[PDB]
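Figure S7 source data.
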Amino acid sequence: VSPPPPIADEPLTVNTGIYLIECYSLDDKAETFKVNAFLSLSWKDRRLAFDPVRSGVRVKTYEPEAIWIPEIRFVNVANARDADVVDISVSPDGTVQYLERFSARVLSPLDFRRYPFDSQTLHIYLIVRSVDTRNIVLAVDLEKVGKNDDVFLTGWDIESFTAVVKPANFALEDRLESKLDYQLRISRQYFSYIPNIILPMLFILFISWTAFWSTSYEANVTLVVSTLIAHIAFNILVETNLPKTPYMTYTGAIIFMIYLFYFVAVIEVTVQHYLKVESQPARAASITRASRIAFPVVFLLANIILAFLFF
Amino acid sequence: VSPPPPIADEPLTVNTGIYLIECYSLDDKAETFKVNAFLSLSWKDRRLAFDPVRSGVRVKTYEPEAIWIPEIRFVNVANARDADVVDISVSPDGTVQYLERFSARVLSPLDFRRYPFDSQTLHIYLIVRSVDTRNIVLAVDLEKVGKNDDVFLTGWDIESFTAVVKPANFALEDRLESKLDYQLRISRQYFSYIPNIILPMLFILFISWTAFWSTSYEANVTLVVSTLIAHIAFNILVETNLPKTPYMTYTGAIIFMIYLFYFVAVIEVTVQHYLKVESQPARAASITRASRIAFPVVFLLANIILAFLFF
Amino acid sequence: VSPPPPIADEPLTVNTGIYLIECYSLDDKAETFKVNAFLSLSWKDRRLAFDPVRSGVRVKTYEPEAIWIPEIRFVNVANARDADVVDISVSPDGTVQYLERFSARVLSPLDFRRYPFDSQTLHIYLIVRSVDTRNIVLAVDLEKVGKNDDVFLTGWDIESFTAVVKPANFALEDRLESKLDYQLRISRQYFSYIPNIILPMLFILFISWTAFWSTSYEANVTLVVSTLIAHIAFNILVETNLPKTPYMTYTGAIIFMIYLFYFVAVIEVTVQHYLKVESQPARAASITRASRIAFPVVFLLANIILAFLFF
Amino acid sequence: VSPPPPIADEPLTVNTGIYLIECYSLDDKAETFKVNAFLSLSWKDRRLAFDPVRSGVRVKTYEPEAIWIPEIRFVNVANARDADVVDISVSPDGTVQYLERFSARVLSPLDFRRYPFDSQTLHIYLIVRSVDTRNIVLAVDLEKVGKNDDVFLTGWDIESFTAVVKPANFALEDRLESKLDYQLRISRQYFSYIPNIILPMLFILFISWTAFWSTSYEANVTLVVSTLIAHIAFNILVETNLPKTPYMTYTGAIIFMIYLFYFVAVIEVTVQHYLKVESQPARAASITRASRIAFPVVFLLANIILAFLFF
Amino acid sequence: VSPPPPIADEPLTVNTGIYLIECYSLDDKAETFKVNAFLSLSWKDRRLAFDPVRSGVRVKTYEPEAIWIPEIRFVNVANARDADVVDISVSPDGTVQYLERFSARVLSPLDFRRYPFDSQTLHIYLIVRSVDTRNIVLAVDLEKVGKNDDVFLTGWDIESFTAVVKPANFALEDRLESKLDYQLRISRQYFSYIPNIILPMLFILFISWTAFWSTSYEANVTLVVSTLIAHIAFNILVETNLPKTPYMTYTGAIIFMIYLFYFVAVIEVTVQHYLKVESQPARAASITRASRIAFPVVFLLANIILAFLFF
Ligand SMILES: [Cl-]
Ligand SMILES: [Cl-]
Ligand SMILES: [Cl-]
Ligand SMILES: [Cl-]
Ligand SMILES: [Cl-]
Ligand SMILES: [Cl-]
Ligand SMILES: [Cl-]
Ligand code: NA
Ligand code: NA
Ligand code: NA
Ligand code: NA
Ligand code: NA
Ligand code: NA
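Tokens for the predicted sodium ion complex:
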């Protein structure tokens, strides 16, 4: 079967639509997400046109093998989508209405700069390659683009599912390619990060600062060193849930900065002890009293600077 | 093959049933579970009807390709179910009795608010899309809905497997869809959480409280800081087995609250030492003696408040 | 093709056999194991019977499509088995001899009460569903039930592979079902648990008991608290290799009991220090001297009680 | 269908091309990467040649079954590629233009010597096995070799995708094999390693060196031993992300060398304490004062030597 | 299609060969490895014999369906191999030359006694089951047994790939089975274990021995207990990479023995402190001075004994 013959030198418009049924397994590290959706296709094939009076039927149902169907692919998929044809209906004017249900693992990169207070735009790229007989162009049928109400993505708020109506027409290996962009806007549910990572990390840091109210070097060493080890555990815990980025993330920035706070606290604890041994506790006391105000103030200001730079 | 022609303007009723054989791999983080079950289908096709006397046979067995079979799908599946037709029997009134054995990874969300003392309702949504010739409606044959006695779900008690008899008939992409809800009620076996997480977590917390019977700041610092690190390990252990929720879980609430108890214990340990150095041990003694009663009382009352709010 | 017509009202006996070739991947947490075996089937089809003199051949070889073959399934499988027909041989009397090689992931629950000194009975349930024309009953051909000598299951001793010769005949969805039970008896190789978990766990516990020969509260706090953290690591290590059980395991019981021993050791260490500060070291000495005998004696007796209750 | 008959004793040239669409899942430990690309093939089949005037058509489109297609395979793949034919076009002179879209898990070894400042050359080996009728040779059509702009590999910078135009023609099992080498040059994004591994590792090492400003053996023991445990955690973290190499990696060298620095710091801390107890603190002071300069100087010089040897 | 008819009562010899192309994913815990290789088969079918003069052709190429092909299987595979026929060539005398490219996950047990200085013999068992008409025997064509030069197994040195030329002919379910043994000899690249596990483990042990040059019980307790916890981390790290063995491994023996060294070091540290408190430091000094020589000497001798027993 050959594609529909053109009337004039016009290309064949294949109207598309994606209706999300299931959205799952957004792998942050792999920047992949799995989708289960309806893919609707519509085009005019004048060769399939019929008279409703003569034939008796209002619409004709065909099997995929029986008629010409456009070779529609996804750009950003790991493997070819798992699809099952639901219906093929032909109107008297030759307007074919195709519907299939598919599942695919979509590969869409994520921007972790504002993690875990980040928002993303997941993409689903529909593509058609033009044939030698005729050029094929994709279009969006806005009435057949949507999502089920029950569609949920664990740890994410699904904002919108829309399509960029004008396709990206380009040439690949001396043939026209018509690419459509389907955008699923999501925003992370940062809630859990607050009692699980952020507050426990702040608590251990604040515990290290109690060494500014102690003259016992042995106890101070235990305070700052133990809490630093807990901070290392939280840093390792955070980087397991995230991929290796060529940029600094919001959480990554905070975590890294906190290391400097532990390092300077060790220096303060060392200086205080050296001075006490040197029989200069008055100078040591001035440094410790200053540190009680300096450490929280510098921490608060540095965080304001970070939050400003990131948001 | 086209669907059965209607007598009047009535829709085609496809009687359904699901008999669970195997139930496994309930992934709490992924909110997925695997199922192996029998799917029974029954509908009337007057075109397949035949003579007992003339034909000789009581029932006719057909191969799936030979006759019209409704395109029955699952809504909440990752991929198309793995199915193998077991039997197709036609009565001579044209009543078709279809049976297939399938396996699928069902995507059903879970409510972790009361974890690990939570109960869930897993869903299996059966769906049929109406054709242009005729509208297809699903029905429940209660005699063909059940589960095997041997059906076990590791770490869960299987309560019931029932079906919501009235389908959710709606329009999707200008076509009628008949959706049925199959509900598998389960309840978590919380037993293991008590000797593995809850009691060990209480033991380390109670060990930190021994600092209220010690004047040794160095020993108290070691007691409260070490036990806090063990509590961090238990917090990390718990959040690995659970997904990131936009709400607080029962275990999550307790674990988070315990951090505040460690933080105030550090403050007490610090205050006590500062006062002793300041040659005010009488005031420090009053604070330590009060803490011996305050810490367990406030812990007990706060837990009563949490248990009340959650259950 | 229809099933063999009955002479009298007798059911069709399908003689079965399973010969294990490969046995692997016993997942303790998932209570699954993978199998690669031969499945032999034999039944009489009088319609396929022939004269050896007239036909010339002693046996006729058929392709699966050519003749009626019983729909044999496994009850406790995740998905339908991966099978490849090896041979189909028909004797002159119509006795069909079918052989296929299959692989499947069998779902069989395990009893962890005596872990790691536990033994299990893995099950493989063969099943046939009766047809409308005739009832099908399964039988065991003991000469075609066995296992290869090289069959090994990492960390397990394969004891026996036998079949319960009398089938469990029952009705499921108004049709007879003939179920056969194939039992693979295994026993865990507990050896590795001794130098890897049990002895290291005892060593750290015995190290904590050295605090009964020390008056240094600071050193005792470090001894009991550090060893308790190592015990937590061993508890976490053990529960990762095991699934969540609604009962107590042997190892689980020991591990949990050891927490109580650490808790009482902390109390002893606290009491001793409080008394010393109170200028009552004579009373503290009596308590410490008693603890030197009490702790190992109570530990030995409690373990005898546990071993008695569990074995 | 037999291959195209030769004019003279010349071999059949199959012009090839690979256009990368998706590049993902580079597993460092497994030395595997997944690819989704276009595979273009072109050869002359004089038997398929036609007159454009007589036939009417400029090009003829065939189904794969209809014509002879060369058996093209990948050398370094885990399993046979997942492919779907896109187009087969025959020119009047018999020049066949084949295009397929495929996905495969490519097995290409990596050189970790300079990790995480390493660059790699991933290989994709195309191969054709000669037939008895004729010898088949592969060629590169440089116009059909490329990559999509959006092609991204998490944690890597994609440098180039080129093909070694001259094939490696050799004999395997007494038949000619024509092998082509497609090279994907990548370079690691080392950025994240600096705030996540390198700096935290340096911070804990520098913290251990504060013991050179302390006379408190108990505090020094806590400083050097605790920081060493954190260094062990970083060593374990690094070797999980890497495979077992029969050579030393850059990061591996640094990490190993740092152990020696901790070991000598323990010796210094021990020597200092022994001398103080021996009532020789003047000699101990000379050793500690020297260590303050020796440790950072030897660390800086040793790192210069390592960086020189590795880069 | 039936097998080739015998001349005399001789069995049908199927000459085999395996040429390794890709060797990957050797899972130590699962005792599995993946293979991608060429499988060559050759047998004489007199029914396919032809005259080169009359037919014109020197060799005839057939499709697998057209002629009788022996049912060749692998014994030690997880699932049936993924195979794709490359060529089938028939010589005038009826000598068929079959070649296929396959991939399979081979299940071959490993001996960990000498780990990580162990060598293994991986097996690939080829098997053919005799038919009722004729008995089939396997043979090795040594000219078609080999491996590609580029064949690499991460963390292993590939020594040789040879075949045991004489098959293991036996009866299984009253039919002859001809089994061939293909052996891939490998030896572990132990290099990485030295700077990653062995030396760091020795360093922490040697650090614990510094307590023999200290009289500070509090510092000694910190030294021996902290290093013991690091040794536990290395023991856990080692047992994750290894399966549970009913025997002791070389590394397992060393690791276990080191626990005894830590235990006796705790006893020494305890005895020394008890004696000092008892105002007997002269006796304590004798014990500590002896331990300085005893501990390294006993460690060196015990390791010589272990190395002797294991190698
Ligand atoms: Cl696709
Ligand atoms: Cl363009
Ligand atoms: Cl074009
Ligand atoms: Cl489905
Ligand atoms: Cl099955
Ligand atoms: Cl391939
Ligand atoms: Cl096989
Ligand atoms: Na078509
Ligand atoms: Na059908
Ligand atoms: Na059949
Ligand atoms: Na072809
Ligand atoms: Na064949
Ligand atoms: Na300490």
